[PDB]
Coordinates of C-alpha atoms and ligand atoms in Angstrom, one line a residue:
X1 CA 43.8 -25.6 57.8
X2 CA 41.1 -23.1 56.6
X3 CA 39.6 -24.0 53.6
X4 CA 40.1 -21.7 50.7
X5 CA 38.0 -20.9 47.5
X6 CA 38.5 -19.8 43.8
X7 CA 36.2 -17.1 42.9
X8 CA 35.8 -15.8 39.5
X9 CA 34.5 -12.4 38.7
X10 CA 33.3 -12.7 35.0
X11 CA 31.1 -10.1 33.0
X12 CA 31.2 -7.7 30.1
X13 CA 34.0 -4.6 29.7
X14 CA 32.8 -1.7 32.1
X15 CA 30.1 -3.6 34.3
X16 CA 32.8 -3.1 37.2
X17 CA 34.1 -6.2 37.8
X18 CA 37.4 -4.4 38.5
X19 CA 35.7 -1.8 40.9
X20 CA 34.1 -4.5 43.1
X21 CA 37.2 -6.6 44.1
X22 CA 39.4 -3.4 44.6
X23 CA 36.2 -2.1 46.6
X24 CA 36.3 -5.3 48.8
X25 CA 40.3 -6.0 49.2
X26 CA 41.3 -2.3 49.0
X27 CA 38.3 -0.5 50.9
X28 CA 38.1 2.0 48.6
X29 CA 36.0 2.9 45.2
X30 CA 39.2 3.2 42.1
X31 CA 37.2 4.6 39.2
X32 CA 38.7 4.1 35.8
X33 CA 40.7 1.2 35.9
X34 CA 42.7 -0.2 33.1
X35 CA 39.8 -2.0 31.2
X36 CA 42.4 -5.4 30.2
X37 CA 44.7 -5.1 33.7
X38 CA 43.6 -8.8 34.9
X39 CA 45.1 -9.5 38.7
X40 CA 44.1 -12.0 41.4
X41 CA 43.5 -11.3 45.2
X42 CA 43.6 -12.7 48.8
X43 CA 41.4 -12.0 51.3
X44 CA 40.3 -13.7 54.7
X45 CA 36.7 -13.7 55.5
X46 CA 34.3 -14.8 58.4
X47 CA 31.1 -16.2 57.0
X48 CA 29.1 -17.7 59.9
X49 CA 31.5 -17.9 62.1
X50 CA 34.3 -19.7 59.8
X51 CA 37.2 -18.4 58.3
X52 CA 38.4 -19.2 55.0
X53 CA 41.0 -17.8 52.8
X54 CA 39.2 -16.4 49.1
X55 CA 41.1 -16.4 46.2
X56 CA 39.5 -14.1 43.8
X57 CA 40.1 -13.9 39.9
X58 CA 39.4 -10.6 38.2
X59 CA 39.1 -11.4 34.8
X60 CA 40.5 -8.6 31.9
X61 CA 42.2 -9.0 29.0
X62 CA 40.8 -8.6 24.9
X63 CA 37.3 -7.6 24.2
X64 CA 36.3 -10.8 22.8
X65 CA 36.3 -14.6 23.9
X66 CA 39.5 -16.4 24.3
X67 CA 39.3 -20.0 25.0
X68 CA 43.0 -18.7 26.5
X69 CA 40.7 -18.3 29.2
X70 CA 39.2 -21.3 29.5
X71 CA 42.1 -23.4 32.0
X72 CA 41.7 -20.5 34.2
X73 CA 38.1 -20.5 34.1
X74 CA 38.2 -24.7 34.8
X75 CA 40.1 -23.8 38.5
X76 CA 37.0 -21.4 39.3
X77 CA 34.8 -22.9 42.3
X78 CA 32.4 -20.2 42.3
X79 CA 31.7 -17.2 39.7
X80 CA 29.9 -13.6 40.3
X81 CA 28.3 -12.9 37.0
X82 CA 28.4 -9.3 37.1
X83 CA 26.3 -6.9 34.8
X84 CA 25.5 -2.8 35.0
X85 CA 22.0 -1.5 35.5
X86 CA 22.3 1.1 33.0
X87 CA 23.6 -1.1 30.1
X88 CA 20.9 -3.3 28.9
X89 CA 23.7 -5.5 26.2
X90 CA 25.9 -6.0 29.9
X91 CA 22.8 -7.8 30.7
X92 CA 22.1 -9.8 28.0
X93 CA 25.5 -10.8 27.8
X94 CA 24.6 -12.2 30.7
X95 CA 23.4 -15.3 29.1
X96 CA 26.5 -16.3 27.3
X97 CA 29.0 -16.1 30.6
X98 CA 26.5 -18.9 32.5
X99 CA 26.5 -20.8 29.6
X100 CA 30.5 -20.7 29.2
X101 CA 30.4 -21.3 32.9
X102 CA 28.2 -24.3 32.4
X103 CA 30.2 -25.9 29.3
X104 CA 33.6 -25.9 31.3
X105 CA 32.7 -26.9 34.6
X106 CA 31.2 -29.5 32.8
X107 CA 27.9 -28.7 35.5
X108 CA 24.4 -27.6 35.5
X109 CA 25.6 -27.2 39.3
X110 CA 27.7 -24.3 39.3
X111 CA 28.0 -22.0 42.3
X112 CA 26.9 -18.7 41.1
X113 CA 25.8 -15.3 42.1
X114 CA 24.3 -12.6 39.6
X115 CA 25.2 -9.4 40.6
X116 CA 23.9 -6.0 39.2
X117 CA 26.1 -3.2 39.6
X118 CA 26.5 0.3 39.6
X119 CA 22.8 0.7 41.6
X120 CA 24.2 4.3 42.9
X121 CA 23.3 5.6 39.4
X122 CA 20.2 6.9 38.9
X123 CA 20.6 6.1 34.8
X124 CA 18.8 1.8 35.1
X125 CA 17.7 0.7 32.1
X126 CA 17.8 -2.9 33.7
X127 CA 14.2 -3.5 35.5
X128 CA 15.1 -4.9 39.2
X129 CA 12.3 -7.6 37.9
X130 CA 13.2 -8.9 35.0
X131 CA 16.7 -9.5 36.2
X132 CA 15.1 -11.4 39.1
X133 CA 13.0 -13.4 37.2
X134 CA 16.3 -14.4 35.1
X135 CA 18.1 -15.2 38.5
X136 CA 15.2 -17.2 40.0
X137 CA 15.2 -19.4 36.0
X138 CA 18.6 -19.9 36.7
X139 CA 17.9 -20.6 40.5
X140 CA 21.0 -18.4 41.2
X141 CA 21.1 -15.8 44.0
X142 CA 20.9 -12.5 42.7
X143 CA 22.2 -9.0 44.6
X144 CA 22.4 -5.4 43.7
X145 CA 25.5 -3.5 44.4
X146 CA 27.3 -0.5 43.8
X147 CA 31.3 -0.6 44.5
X148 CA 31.2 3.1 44.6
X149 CA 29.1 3.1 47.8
X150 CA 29.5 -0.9 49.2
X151 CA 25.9 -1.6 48.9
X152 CA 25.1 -5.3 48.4
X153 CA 29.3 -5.4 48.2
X154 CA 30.1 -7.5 51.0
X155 CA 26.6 -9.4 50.7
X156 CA 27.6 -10.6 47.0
X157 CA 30.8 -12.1 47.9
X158 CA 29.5 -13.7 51.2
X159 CA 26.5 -15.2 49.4
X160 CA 29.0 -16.7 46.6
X161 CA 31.3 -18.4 49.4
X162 CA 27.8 -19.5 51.3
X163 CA 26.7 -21.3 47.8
X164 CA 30.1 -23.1 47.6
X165 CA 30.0 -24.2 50.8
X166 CA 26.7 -26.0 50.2
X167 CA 28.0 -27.3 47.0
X168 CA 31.0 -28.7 48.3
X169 CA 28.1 -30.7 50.9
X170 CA 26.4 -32.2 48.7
Ligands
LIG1 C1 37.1 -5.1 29.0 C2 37.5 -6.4 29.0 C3 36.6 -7.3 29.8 O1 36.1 -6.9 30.9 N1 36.4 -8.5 29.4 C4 37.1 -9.2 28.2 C5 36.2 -10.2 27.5 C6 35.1 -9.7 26.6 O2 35.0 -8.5 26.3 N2 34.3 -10.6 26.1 C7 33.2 -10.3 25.1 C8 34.3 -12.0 26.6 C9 33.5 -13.0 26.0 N3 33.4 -14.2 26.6 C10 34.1 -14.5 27.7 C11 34.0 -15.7 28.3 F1 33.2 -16.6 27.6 C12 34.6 -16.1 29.5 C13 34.4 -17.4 30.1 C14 35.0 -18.5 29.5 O3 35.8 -18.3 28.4 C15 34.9 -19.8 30.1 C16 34.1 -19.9 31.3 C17 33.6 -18.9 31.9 C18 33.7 -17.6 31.3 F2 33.1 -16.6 31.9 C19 35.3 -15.1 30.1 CL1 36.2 -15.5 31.6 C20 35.5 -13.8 29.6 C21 34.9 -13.5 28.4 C22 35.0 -12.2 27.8 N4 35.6 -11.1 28.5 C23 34.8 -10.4 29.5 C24 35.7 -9.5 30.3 C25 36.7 -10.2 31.2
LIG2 N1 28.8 5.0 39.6 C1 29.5 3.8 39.5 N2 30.5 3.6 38.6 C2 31.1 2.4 38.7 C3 30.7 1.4 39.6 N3 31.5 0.3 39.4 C4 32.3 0.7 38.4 N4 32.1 2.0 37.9 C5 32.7 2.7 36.9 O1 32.4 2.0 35.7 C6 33.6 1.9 34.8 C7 34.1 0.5 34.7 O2 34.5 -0.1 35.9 P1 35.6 -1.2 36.0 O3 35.8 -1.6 37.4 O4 36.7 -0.8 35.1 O5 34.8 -2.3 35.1 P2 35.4 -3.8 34.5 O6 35.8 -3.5 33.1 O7 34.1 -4.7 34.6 O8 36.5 -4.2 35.4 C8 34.6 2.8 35.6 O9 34.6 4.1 34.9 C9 34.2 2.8 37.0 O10 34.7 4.0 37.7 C10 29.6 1.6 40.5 O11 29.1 0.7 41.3 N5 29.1 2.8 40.4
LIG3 MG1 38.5 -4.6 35.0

């Protein structure tokens, strides 16, 4: 067949985790969406010229951790770490989702993107820098998006399924 891949988008309550996959299954921005609503979606991509089928995880639910989560978490291949560049504590939190990441993968080789969000506002508080310099300690990708407009949108997602395809190589 084509192959397919579980992505997880993982982050704090109102980074837009939710805005971003409806933004690339729905083709359109939905503003305000239920902050717990958790749903997961299909979608068929060409990346380089192959197909594959992405299964993608947006994660909801309480405002705190739940190892609840954690079984769910196990099936993820790849993860966007998703904050919002004008809440500095999104970013911070930032931290504690790679290590979560980390402890049940049971991997310092995760496939991972970090993703800052919402770059149509003109309200950053996160410097551009300093979240590259986390994403190059990390050595994860790192892209800016906004689901309102699509920038970085597509580019996100596409570099998450390029990182698990080299993964799954090695
Ligand atoms: C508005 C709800 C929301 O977007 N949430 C719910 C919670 C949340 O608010 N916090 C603080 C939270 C804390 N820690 C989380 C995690 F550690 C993980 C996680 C694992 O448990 C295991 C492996 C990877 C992980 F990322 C997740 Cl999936 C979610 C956590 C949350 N949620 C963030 C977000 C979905
Ligand atoms: N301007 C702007 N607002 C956004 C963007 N992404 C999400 N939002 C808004 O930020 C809030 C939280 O988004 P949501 O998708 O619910 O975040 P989640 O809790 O991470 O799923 C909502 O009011 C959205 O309309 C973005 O790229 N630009
Ligand atoms: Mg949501």
């Amino acid at each position: 067949g084509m192959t397919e891949y579980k992505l997880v988008v993982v982050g704090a309550c109102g980074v837009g985790k939710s805005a971003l996959t409806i933004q690339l299954i729905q083709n359109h921005f939905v503003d305000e969406y239920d902050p717990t609503i958790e749903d997961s979606y299909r979608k068929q991509v060409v990346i380089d010229g192959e197909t594959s089928l992405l299964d993608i995880l947006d994660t909801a639910g309480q405002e705190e951790y739940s190892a609840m989560r954690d079984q769910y978490m196990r099936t993820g291949e790849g993860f966007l770490l998703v904050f919002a560049i004008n809440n500095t504590k999104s970013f911070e939190d930032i931290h504690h989702y790679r290590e979560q990441i980390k402890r049940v993968k049971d991997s310092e080789d995760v496939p991972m993107v970090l993703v800052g969000n919402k770059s149509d506002l003109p309200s950053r508080t996160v410097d551009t820098k300093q979240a590259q310099d986390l994403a190059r300690s990390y050595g994860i990708p790192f892209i800016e998006t906004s689901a309102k407009t699509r920038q970085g949108v597509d580019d996100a997602f596409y570099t998450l399924i390029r990182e698990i395809r080299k993964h799954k190589e090695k």
